[PDB]
Amino acid sequence: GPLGSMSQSNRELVVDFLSYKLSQKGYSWSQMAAVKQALREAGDEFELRYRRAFSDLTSQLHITPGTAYQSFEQVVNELFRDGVNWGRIVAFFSFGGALCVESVDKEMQVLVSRIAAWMATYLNDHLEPWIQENGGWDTFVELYG
């Protein structure tokens, strides 16, 4: 309901802000918060270090709504064709972000929620088995956090 939603929204705002302030001091609200923060930083670092190459590949992105799924799946399949590792996983997230930004740039905002769903499905079905076999997201935090 509207009343509860208002209450729930205020709570989430508080949690979000506190999580952020804690992270700035190297603390975390929760393990989930720690993972989110590690992934954000790793994505930033990835995109910063390899700025030339990342801009290059994203400049090759010429998506239309009718070709975006094929573009997403074909890149991601090739990315993981001969293995999964933490760096390729960071690359997978960064690629998804780039696609969302490009979609909004070109007034294709409708693609944003679709890309998120495609990424979540891929993560669930194709990355999670490796992730669980390799120490889970807690292990990623230990390495890239």
Binding site: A42, E45, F46, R49, Y50, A53, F54, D56, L57, Q60, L61, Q74, V75, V76, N77, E78, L79, N85, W86, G87, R88, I89, V90, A91, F92, F95, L143, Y144
Partner: peptide, 18 residues
Amino acid sequence: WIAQELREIGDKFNAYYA
């Protein structure tokens, strides 16, 4: 092409940390 370049930098990033 995109995926090749993405894969290359992903592996570089991986090699550094993991």
